[PDB]
Symmetry: C2
Subunit: 134 residues, 2 copies
């Protein structure tokens, strides 16, 4: 179902570039970097329409058998249903560095101080079209 890259270590000093296409009537889709679908160190949720959330990015971490931690939000939203997007992520032990399709960036804490991640995945209303992890 989901698009994923599994067990190709995403390590300090590497870059992850993902391209895809948002579905036409998307509600929301996320990129996730972590360990599993129940262990995500960087979740970035792209909310076209979700409760009160319209055109907002919501970022958070997910701890296995615990739940979502503190959410962070950004109003930067260079994303269009039906359209291509491209995201690039790098990280060091303190921070995830996220660059969006228009070159705008968001940063999110590396809460575990992890130096590598074995799972990258997209979920929700979109699809991936290319990946560079290197």
């Amino acid at each position: 179902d989901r698009a994923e890259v599994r067990n190709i270590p995403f390590k300090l000093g590497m870059s992850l570039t993902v391209g895809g296409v948002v579905n036409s009537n998307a509600t929301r889709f996320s990129i996730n970097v972590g360990e599993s679908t129940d262990s995500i160190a960087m979740h970035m949720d792209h909310r076209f329409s979700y409760g009160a959330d319209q055109n907002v990015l919501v970022l958070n971490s997910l701890v296995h058998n615990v739940g979502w931690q503190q959410e962070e939000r950004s109003k930067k939203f260079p994303f269009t249903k039906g359209d291509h997007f491209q995201i690039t992520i790098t990280f060091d032990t303190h921070t995830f560095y996220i660059q969006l399709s228009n070159g705008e960036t968001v940063e999110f804490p590396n809460r575990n101080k992890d130096a590598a991640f074995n799972l990258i995945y997209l979920a929700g209303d979109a699809r991936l079209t290319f990946v560079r992890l290197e």
Copy 2:
């Protein structure tokens, strides 16, 4: 366990470059392009020591609930246990075009005439370190 890229379509005209490291005491490891672990359109097996097979590449397809089809072999074997390797694959409807770490190439028939593949994986005695699928 295995390293994989799943549901990022590997389509006609795209290129797949994978880099990794062969384990030190490897027997064999494969790169696979297909549909699932029981449906592989291009299997390329890297046999350091396997029966009578030493330093040989064995290529084949795997049909779901049927089995392996006709094997093809190459004596091109620019691969060292413990060492990095890089492989690039492209394909059109008739052929898979495989380039090895030293620039040597092998070709293998696209037996199904498939135009896209949702699963790429490495199995056996090695690990992946980067991937470009684009």
